[PDB]
Structure formats: C-alpha cells, structure tokens
Design a protein around this ligand. Sequence first.
Ligand SMILES: [Zn+2]
Lengths: 81, 150, 126
Amino acid sequence: VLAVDLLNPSPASEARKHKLKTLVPAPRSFFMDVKCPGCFTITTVFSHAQTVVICQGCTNVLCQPTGGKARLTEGCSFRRK
Amino acid sequence: GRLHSKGKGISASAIPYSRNPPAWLKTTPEQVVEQICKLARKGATPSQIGVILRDSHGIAQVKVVTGNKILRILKSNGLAPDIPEDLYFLIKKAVAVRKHLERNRKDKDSKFRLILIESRIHRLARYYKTVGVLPPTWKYESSTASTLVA
Amino acid sequence: VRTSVLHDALNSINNAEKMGKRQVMIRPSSKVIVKFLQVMQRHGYIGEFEEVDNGKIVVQLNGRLNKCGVISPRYNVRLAELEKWVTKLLPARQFGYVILTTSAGIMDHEEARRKHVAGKIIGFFY
RNA sequence: GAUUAAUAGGGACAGUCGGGGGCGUCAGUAUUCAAUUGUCAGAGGUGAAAUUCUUGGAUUUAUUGAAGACUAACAACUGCGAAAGCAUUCGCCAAGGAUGUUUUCAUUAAUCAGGAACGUAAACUAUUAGGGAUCGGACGGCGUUUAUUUUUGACCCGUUCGGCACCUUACGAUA
RNA sequence: GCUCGUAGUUGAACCUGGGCCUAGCCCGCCGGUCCGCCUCACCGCGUGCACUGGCUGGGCUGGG
Ligand SMILES: [Zn+2]
C-alpha cells in the first residue's frame, strides 16, 4: 500500500482474484480426457460442460451438468489437458 | 448495466490469450468447418453450434482455429438465419407473451414484461437496420410477429 | 458513462495522488493516455509505467504532482492565444504544463513554443 | 475480400434460486349464522353505566354443517419484484435474476423533449477500505453426521463472482 | 409514483515496393613481384594462412 509493483502481482494473490480481475483476464476452466473401463475410446470433456456428454456410442454418460463444474460419472479416469 | 432490471451481475465468459494453438486439442480447421456446415444444415443457430462444439469436439473458438467466426462462416457459405438469431429469439419470446396475454389479460406484470421485450426488440432492430443487415422498415407487432414465429 | 477514457485515467491518477498510493491500475488503456503519461514522465511527475495486456497500465508515481485534468470541449489555440491560455490554466507560468494535440504530435507548451506549432488544448497537469 | 473480442452489449445451453405473477386445487383455525343436546339466572359493555339479548332459555359446555375473510407462531439489521407490493400445500402456465460454459451477430449502446404500461393520510426526523455478519451460484477439503459403503445433502473452512443493509473512514464535499 | 420510449445530446480502442550512397568484414575473380609448372622458343597458367594492388563481382551487419 502506497507503493507496490502493479505489473508483477504475486501468483498467490493473482490466483485468488476473480477471473475478469486478473492482470490480463483469462479462464480457470480446463479440458479432461475420459475413458470408461470397458472401452478404449478417449472422449475429451470440458470441465464446466452443459451437455450430458456421451462416449462415441454405447448409451452411457460421462458427466452431468451443474451450476459449476460438470460432475464426471462413477468410475472414470481423467488426465487434464 | 444489464439494461432493464436493476442489478449489476458480473457473469461473463472469459477468453484466454494466444489466439492460435491449443495444440493438444487436435483436428484440422477444415474438419471443424465441415462439422459446423453439417450442423447448420440440420438447422441450428450459431450459438447452438458453438455449444455443440464445446460439448463434443476438440475446439476452443472457431475464430482461433479458423480465420473466421461461426456466423461469418455461415454467411460465406450462405447458410445464415433470416433474422439474426438473437432477434429471432426475442420475437419468439414476444409472440409467447402475446399468446399468454390473449389467454389471460389482467396479468399486468406480463404486459409490462411484454412492453420491455418490445422495447428491447426495437433497440436491436434499429441497430440491425443501420448495419445494413435487415431491409428498411421492419414492423414487430402481432400482424408480422405471428407470421414470423419460427 | 464517460467515453473520455483519458478522463477516467486522469481521475484515477488524481485519486492516487490524493490517497498517497504508489501505483495505479488504469484499467482501460489507449494511445492518447500513453502519450499523456509520456509527457508527464518527461517532466518527471510520474516515475515509470508499463502497459500489460489481458490491456491496462501500471503507473509508478513519485508523489510529486498535484492535479491532472482534461479540457473537455478541446478548444483550438494559436500561440498568441497560447500564452493567455497557459497563464489562465496554470497557477504559475513556471509550475505545471498544458498538453497540446498538435500537428507534430502530443507535447507540452514549452515544446510547442520550441517547435513553433499551435493546436488544440487537450489537458494539463501541475 | 472479414481487427482487438470490450474490465458496455443482446441471445443460447446446464444446474439452479426466489413469501415475483396468473389459473385451479388442498388445508388450517378463528368469527358469524343455524341445528342437536346438558343447561338454569343472568349475559354484555364500561372508568361507572345505559341501549340490547334474556324461563320460547340468553352468555356458557359439547358435536356437526354452511358462508365469507385471512394465512398466527416460523418471520429476520433477510428473500423476490422496476414500483405499489408479495407469506397454507400441491399441480399447470409462461417470465425473471445470478453463476458456470470448451456459446454465438460485433456496435448493436448511454441519456431523456413528445408519448405509452402498471397505482383516509401526515405528525419528532474512479475509489473510499476494510472488517464482521448475510444470502444466491461456482470451485476446492483436515474432518464429524447421512453411510450397511459410493453418491449426495447438513456443519466447519478457504477462493471467487453478484446483491439487499451496518459501522468506521471521508477520498471529499457542500445549501 | 416507477419502467419503457422518440426528437435531441454524448458516442470505445486498434491503422508508416524499387533504387542510390556509405563503413566494416568475409567468399570469389583479376593485374603485377617471388616461387613452381609446362612449352624448343615466343608465350601462358597456378600463384594474397609467400608479397602487393584492383573488382559498379557475390554475401551479412551498421549509418544516410
Ligand atoms: Zn465408450
């Protein structure tokens, strides 16, 4: 307070700032890869999906939508990129 | 600030930096374009197209992958809605409210909201008229809104 | 809404110079704001600024300036008018500067009298 | 041949949120009226009285029935609606807010001349800079209780947007 | 009383090809000295980590 480096905020204070209020704004959502153990299929799901994402066939599920992050279903794997 | 009703509301969708790569989210731009074209042929709005892409395919933004936005792409391949999506949805909403009023009239709150929607439509309509989108003279009353419906 | 983003920036600078802070976050950036702060930095009333991108400007200020202002109708001014405009805008002729959007760019009134060019009065600081 | 994608817009989708609105429906007592009994001398009001009802039985006691009204306690330094205002359950009908999104056209916007929709009272009076509460999302988690174990919810904590209000400070003001 | 709304008013940011000269170096070409080659000789060729000068030959960088 009184003087601070405004071009170099700390990553920890930057990380607790709201989305639109970081120095250059940017998202905080991510993409996941999801397989369901009987299938060798790799569907890529967005973290905050509004669609009941289905794998390439097999009338299953992969996630359900919410007010925030998509709740991935049951036993499923996820790497995140 | 959110136009009609009081209340700020900062609910906004963020756009990241570097308008080019997301590399590990593969697939050529041509394939994405053909998928968008297929969706347009099935009869879906640009916003619905974007939502579908978000759901299933390895995309971030069309404007990132391809040189153009969705609406712009649709216009290049001549597969665009008659009344630019948002305007169409507003007129559908206005029709629904008018039909509700016809069913039951005394509801004054519904009549007020109808008036609000009509004002918002006129606000959109003037600016669409200015940017050479819609032909000059565009009525938005029950004589023409009902005919439009879909 | 104030479309004068230069006036929003200069309002933020005046609020920081009153509150005794040592930097700001000028949230809507421009190019006329960058030229304005370039003149203020030439005359030493602002330490060091950077334009970061989402963009915004981080302006390290020394604690030396008193007031920033924009002239909102942006009146045109010749040199023989410029002397009277300087002595009617500033508290003293040796304190503070008047900003001019000339045909040679954006500069202070002493640089305008050096380069023999007139123009519109856009702002002032002291 | 088509920029930043705006820390201004409008729309779409998802989980939602609300004593917001309309129509129906369901209850709850209480009051009045009437009936059936047990009555058996006053009852009602008022500071005192009086008008009135009262052996064909008033007021009272019990049980039913009808009608109209309203929704106690929960009920708040809260919630929703632009305002007046809005509190029984359930169903239907559209609408709205905020959040999240891996959603779109890219100035569409801001302000109000003219005009348009909703409608017995008064009486003491660019930030402040954060903190403690509060509710609506969204995310995260050492854990207690659901949980016969996963969901999921309740409680505690942190981050983040958004909003009614408190106190401090004014950053000042000024009539 | 509140909201919508027209004339009117304020209206976001983003937006200086060719040739000539010049200095430094490199790569290459060319003339001469020295040395070597070959030609009977005349002569020519190689010849600047042996020497020296030229090239409006080619390349990179700086300045006008
Ligand atoms: Zn599968």
